[PDB]
Amino acid sequence: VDQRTRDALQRSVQLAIEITTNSQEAAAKHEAQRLEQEARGRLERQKILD
Amino acid sequence: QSEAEKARKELLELEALSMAVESTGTAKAEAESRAEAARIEGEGSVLQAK
């Protein structure tokens, strides 16, 4: 019935989106770090093999 | 780093042979030149004494 109570619940869902977006950004960041490490790990072996 | 060290072991094996060649060449050259000069001086001194 209250409008304030309804206003307090939209701020409950404006953060449930940010949880998901910060989660996908974290997953992409971890995958980028894993790929950069695998690239570095093959380049470092190839230098000694040269 | 394990695979990088597995290749680096082989590089360190080859540098051992390179360092062996590079040291024994300098030693052999600087020894044999002075041996030849000493032979020349000895064969000269026999004739000079005659």
XYZ file of C-alpha atoms in Angstrom:
100
model
C 0.000 0.000 0.000
C 2.816 2.390 0.879
C 4.758 4.159 -1.850
C 7.924 4.282 0.239
C 7.808 0.516 0.636
C 7.601 0.223 -3.146
C 10.546 2.616 -3.514
C 12.614 0.465 -1.174
C 12.025 -2.577 -3.384
C 13.217 -1.054 -6.664
C 16.564 -0.395 -5.006
C 16.518 -4.106 -4.190
C 16.474 -4.991 -7.892
C 18.840 -2.281 -9.071
C 21.555 -4.202 -7.218
C 20.559 -7.683 -8.383
C 21.559 -6.574 -11.892
C 24.922 -5.251 -10.693
C 25.641 -8.591 -9.010
C 25.248 -10.333 -12.371
C 27.209 -7.760 -14.389
C 30.096 -7.688 -11.917
C 30.026 -11.494 -11.987
C 30.304 -11.696 -15.790
C 33.090 -9.101 -15.726
C 34.953 -11.152 -13.128
C 34.549 -14.351 -15.164
C 35.795 -12.646 -18.333
C 38.726 -11.168 -16.400
C 39.736 -14.570 -15.037
C 39.558 -16.064 -18.520
C 41.673 -13.228 -19.941
C 44.301 -13.805 -17.246
C 44.328 -17.544 -17.948
C 44.836 -16.976 -21.668
C 47.599 -14.407 -21.110
C 49.351 -16.898 -18.853
C 49.084 -19.726 -21.389
C 50.446 -17.480 -24.159
C 53.364 -16.416 -21.956
C 54.014 -20.027 -21.025
C 54.354 -21.144 -24.625
C 56.478 -18.147 -25.653
C 58.898 -18.764 -22.774
C 59.434 -22.368 -23.833
C 59.903 -21.362 -27.464
C 62.685 -18.892 -26.599
C 64.822 -21.578 -24.925
C 64.046 -23.953 -27.795
C 65.405 -21.309 -30.189
C 58.282 -23.356 -15.504
C 58.790 -27.123 -15.369
C 58.747 -27.444 -19.168
C 60.861 -24.304 -19.543
C 63.436 -25.913 -17.241
C 63.262 -29.167 -19.209
C 64.344 -27.284 -22.316
C 66.819 -25.115 -20.401
C 68.596 -28.289 -19.262
C 69.349 -29.079 -22.904
C 70.573 -25.539 -23.589
C 72.861 -25.815 -20.549
C 74.135 -29.120 -21.919
C 75.090 -27.528 -25.229
C 76.747 -24.481 -23.651
C 79.016 -26.875 -21.740
C 80.412 -28.258 -24.996
C 80.767 -24.738 -26.415
C 82.694 -23.571 -23.339
C 84.884 -26.683 -23.483
C 85.815 -26.001 -27.118
C 86.375 -22.282 -26.459
C 88.741 -23.010 -23.569
C 90.727 -25.878 -25.070
C 91.363 -23.954 -28.296
C 92.983 -21.011 -26.530
C 95.026 -23.367 -24.342
C 96.241 -25.505 -27.266
C 97.167 -22.518 -29.452
C 99.072 -20.623 -26.774
C 100.915 -23.800 -25.801
C 101.894 -24.970 -29.286
C 103.189 -21.584 -30.473
C 105.653 -21.366 -27.590
C 106.629 -25.001 -28.111
C 107.453 -24.305 -31.758
C 109.463 -21.177 -30.895
C 111.382 -23.160 -28.269
C 112.142 -25.861 -30.857
C 113.466 -23.210 -33.257
C 115.686 -21.661 -30.572
C 117.084 -25.056 -29.559
C 117.900 -26.130 -33.093
C 119.542 -22.747 -33.566
C 121.625 -23.021 -30.398
C 123.097 -26.367 -31.491
C 124.476 -24.764 -34.661
C 125.578 -21.644 -32.780
C 127.529 -23.821 -30.357
C 129.157 -25.667 -33.263
